[PDB]
Amino acid sequence: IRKYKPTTPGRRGASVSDFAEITRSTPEKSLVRPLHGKGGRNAHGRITTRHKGGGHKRAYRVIDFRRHDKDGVNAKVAHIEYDPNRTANIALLHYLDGEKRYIIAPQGLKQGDVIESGANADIKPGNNLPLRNIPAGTVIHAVELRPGGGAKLARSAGVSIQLLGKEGTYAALRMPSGEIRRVDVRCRATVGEVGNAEQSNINWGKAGRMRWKGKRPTVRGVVMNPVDHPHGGGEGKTSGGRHPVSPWGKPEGRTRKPNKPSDKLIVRRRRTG
RNA sequence: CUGCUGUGAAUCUGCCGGGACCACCCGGUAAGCCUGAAUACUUCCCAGUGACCGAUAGCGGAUUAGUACCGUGAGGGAAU
RNA sequence: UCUACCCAUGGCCAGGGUGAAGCGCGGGUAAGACCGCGUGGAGGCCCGAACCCACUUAGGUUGAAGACUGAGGGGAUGAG
RNA sequence: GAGUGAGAAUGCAGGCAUGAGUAGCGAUUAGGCAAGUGAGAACCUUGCCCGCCGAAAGACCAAGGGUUCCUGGGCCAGGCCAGUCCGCCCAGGGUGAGUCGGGACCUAAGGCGAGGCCGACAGGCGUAGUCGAUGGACAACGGGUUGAUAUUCCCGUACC
RNA sequence: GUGGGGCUGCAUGGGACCUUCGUUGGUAGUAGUCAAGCGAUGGGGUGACGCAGGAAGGUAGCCGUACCGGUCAGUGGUAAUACCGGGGUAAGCCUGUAGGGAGUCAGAUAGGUAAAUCCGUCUGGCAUAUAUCCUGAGAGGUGAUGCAUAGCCGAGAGGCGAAUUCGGUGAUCCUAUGCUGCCGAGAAAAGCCUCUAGCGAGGACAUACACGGCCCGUACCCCAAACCAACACAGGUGGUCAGGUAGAGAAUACUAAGGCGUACGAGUGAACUAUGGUUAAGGAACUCGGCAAAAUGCCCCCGUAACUUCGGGAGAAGGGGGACCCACAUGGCGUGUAAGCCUCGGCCCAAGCGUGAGUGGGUGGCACAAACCAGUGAGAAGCGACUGUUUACUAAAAACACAGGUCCGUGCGAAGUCGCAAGACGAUGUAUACGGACUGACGCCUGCCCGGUGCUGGAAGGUUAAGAGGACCCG
RNA sequence: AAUUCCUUGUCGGGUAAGUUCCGACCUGCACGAAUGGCGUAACGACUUCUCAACUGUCUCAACCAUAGACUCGGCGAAAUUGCACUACGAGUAAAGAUGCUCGUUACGCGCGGCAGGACGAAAAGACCCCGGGACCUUCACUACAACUUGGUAUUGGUGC
RNA sequence: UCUGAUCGUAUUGGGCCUCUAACCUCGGACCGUAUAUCCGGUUCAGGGACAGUGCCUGGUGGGUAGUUUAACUGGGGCGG
RNA sequence: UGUCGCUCAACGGAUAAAAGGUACCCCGGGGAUAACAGGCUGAUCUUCCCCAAGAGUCCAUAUCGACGGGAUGGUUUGGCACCUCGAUGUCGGCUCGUCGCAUCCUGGGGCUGGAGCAGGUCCCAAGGGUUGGGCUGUUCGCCCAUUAAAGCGGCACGCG
């Protein structure tokens, strides 16, 4: 966190991430694939996700999330690199082999330090392992849901899963959301808590700083017309005049997995508060 | 009589119809396939006909006519 | 092909102020914290042309124009 | 036997009156004289003055237009007036590339999409591919001529 | 159940018999294999990218000038000591300057879907050199004994045609996709070079000569009477050049190059309307309302209040000087030649050429930012935090949005949405994330109520559909 | 009070005078806490009020110049239109008279100006009522999309 | 055989448990395929008679559609 | 054949089954029907009387005149719906006015509870005059300075 001095009215309550730990300004030519911003529109071209205006263009920087091969092959990080489309800095592994890859870069991962994938890995911050090998209680991330499928949980900034007791074939992983979902064991995970927890203390300061970042203005529901939202016109400031409701009339309740889904693994859901 | 979804048999003392349904009599032989004429129609061509029009009529169009023009476009659409 | 938003790829923004972080020096101290000085040139910063709008007023009001013209007006490195 | 009788439907098509020989004649630059051409001159042709634009009202392109360019001719149509003039009318001519802007080189967004999947049917998506510059790669400059073309023709020197 | 006795059986660590592996002895550096070159449709590098902003080097232009050609512009003065016009020339080819960037050689490895001498990666070695390589504005030479051009001539065409140095100023253009920052993290693919796979007995290079070079666009307009506007329409239209003198400037005033006088005129002091001008005395009395005008306005010094989120407010407010000539001044500053020194070199550098700012003395006017251009200021309240957005064509705001806040949903081909579905967006994202709802920075806060209506959970009761179940009844 | 009808509430300040403005009182018809409450530096072509300077806004208008207007020459429309050698008064009338009544005034035809009337032109009233549409809303009615419940088919063995 | 407690053999339903063979997997690896995150196939690893999709059936359902929403009335509305 | 099932009560009963908004509105109509003006009326309003109970030390009448009665005007709120809905533009202000007298000033007079100056009231009289500001969109009104005075009204609440 670094607070901008309140010089102009848009940098008053602003802050910008230090970006500390970033060894290199530019990503490797070999790994940075390209992705055009889609606009919030599917193949029919219609506004499908709303509020997704064009934002500075980005380049993809392939992280692989599986790392099944070369478990024994040690690695060393070379650089921690900034990534646009994560909420993270991404570490760059050179293997002994010399192939170059990208990791979502946990905390305490200095530049230079030796990590190792595979089954006889030591439990260090940074390295892959199945859930078979990890001692219960340690903080793991990336984990995944289905074996070989690749990392699909705890990928965000400073956000990590705690592995409670595995009991045979299933391991009870208690999510960042406090939800307790039993993955199977032969899935992998990456030991360590994910880096860059300093963000979300960022205020984006001014209005257009969240536009560069790709987000368009959100007209809230009341101001529109009766045609145009359930919270229609009225004559003055309407509260909504009805129970609060998605712009397509769907009630603001539930919306979780429909009944009869494959929720066998979910042994306890998150909480309201 | 016919579609979809379930159930689902019998071959002649069988089976189906005779306006719910049952009994007797009547009729017919399903779950297989073709089948001409009688009938409808007129882009085109021929031969005619008119108590049909005669150039604001008769086709939008007797004259460069779906032309000029109008319109992004579909489309509209003259006059002599 | 107008206009509303979005995607890809280009191009434009005369000129003049202001002086943030960082950096370098000096004071300070135990190091500090901090305080002056230079550098540096940030900003949905400032003044103002192109350019984009259209606030006020006058005209026009069978207009020069089926929405413009003149004097002023706002933005003008950015949500352009 | 009737498409059978109009004065009126803010009725339709053509024609023509009233307003009326009225209002206008489209800027913020401005014209004058001399001489000519001609039946005819405020406007056309030339000279001398005067004024206007000069980050344009100058010079070059894209797009779009279509011969409007040049030469000769014309002045019943048009030009908000007249016209000998014209961006108008007629007839003939004029547009020359290894290097410029493109294609034969390449892809972005996106379009189409073999098969394929989905779909009662029509069709909806999409993989390989294959198109798509507003971008990338690629070899040329200076002068001269025509009544009209010039990095195109020619001259001098180059490069792929 | 309690400890010590057991054989044997199972289980464990270690060396040895065979096997297998390791090692040297003759052969077998021979039967074996690669080695000219084109080298991929394959591999790898490169192509390969953002925004802001100086600083330096240049250069284009421009202004002067040595020098060349010329004029007497019927006036008071000026014969060349004044004035007018010249004072040019490109791509390429040489050199490799300023600037900018780079360690190189060997060995090992299968990581790059097969193979690699390439690319990675790890080891060592010698290196930090103004070395070498790469890139590269510009200067210089050549291109150019040509082409050009001021003028000269007779007379539309022809020919002749001198000098062609030096400074200064200065780009938004070039170096430059460079460099330093910064967060918002900035297309791919052909091309180019290399690597082997594979082709291969021919093939590469140099010099010369002779050749081939395809298709379309090419006129003319192009900020317009030729395009879109029904019109020879006061509107709209993207890019490239960017002269001078003042000026900070592409503002504006005049003006060069070049183009226009653009298509109803002649008049005439009517009223009145439109656009301009000026006004005694008063100065908002006008009026819905200081609307419209008028005023202020530039540069440098002095000066600055409450309040404050400590950044501002602020150019607050208010005030002074500004012209021309001369003196310090042959001074300074910039640039830099010849000479001077040192080791496409560097330093200073008389002169020249340019240019402030200030003190001092004057001079003149009514007026010295003299024209054009060019803030009105202050105090208070309401709403909105702000910069933005909006009803094209009567509403620009207090409305929208916003940064920030809370809640609800969402565990992942998620929720949500578009589609009949597959499929896609969300997102090549993973609860510090996405979606929805409200509020709208900041500061201090956000009280009570779950009865109604919703939402979330719970099945103990009542009440409830199809499906099974066919008593009794009827034909 | 962007909410307060009564209400120009009452008191205080500014003004010579203040239905607007600023501070306060509380009897809030009918403020009130994320449809947020109260504040608030900076910011506003926002709304309201006061002042300084300055002015034709005014007291109270004047003069000058352009472009129209006016005159002569050229081309030359338009909306409107039952007529026509289309006076005024007091009346009368579908209740506001150029046309009817009784009187009064007034030669014929133009031109430049001003706008009282022609219930002036334009737009088959935007208000109001009747009829019909539209679109929007909801505990109006009736359906449907979508979501969800159970059966049964796809669809089976095993044990309790 | 009865007023009724009961097993064992079939049928017939309800519930739960697990299994794998239907089916499902946007979970992997190979093949079509030189190219290919589509699709198809083989196999592994999982779910698993559940889900999904038919047919039947009850709910919620301004999300959406079609329409109704009286007349008298000293103009309508409110009242009656 | 006999009877039964409907606040079908909007009771001759449009369906077994149905509520609102529109200032975002639209279309067909209507002066059958409202708004603004005009017209009839005159409840109300305004001006003026008739009677005289009383107040006025006495005295009804100098001046007020209750309780009652009768009218004028057509200016207030109206009542009616006759003109106009195939269009009669609204309040204020400004500019320009013209008329009435039921006179605010000036002029002439009668009576006084008129000593004088100044008043009151009535009668005659419309020639001219009848201010400028503050607040309000304001008409009205309050106010501040004056004045001889700061008139009342009509004319589509005169005049777009």
Author numbering: 3 to 275
From the paper:
Here, we have used single particle cryo-EM reconstruction to determine the endogenous structures of M. smegmatis (Ms) 70S ribosome in the hibernating state, trans-translating state, and P-tRNA bound P/P state. Ms ribosome shares the conserved ribosomal architecture with Ec ribosome. With a conserved core structure of ribosome, mycobacterial ribosome exhibits various unique extensions in its rRNAs and r-proteins.
Compared to Ec, Ms LSU has one additional protein bL37 located near the peptidyl transferase center (PTC). The rRNA extensions of the Ms LSU are the most striking features of the mycobacterial ribosome. Ms H15 (A272–U318) is extended by 36 nt in comparison to Tth H15 (absent from Ec). This insertion is present at the base of the central protuberance and extends to interact with bL27. H54a is a Mycobacteria-specific 113 nt long insertion in H54 at position G1532 which emerges at the solvent side of LSU near the L1 stalk and unequivocally is the most prominent feature of mycobacterial ribosomes.
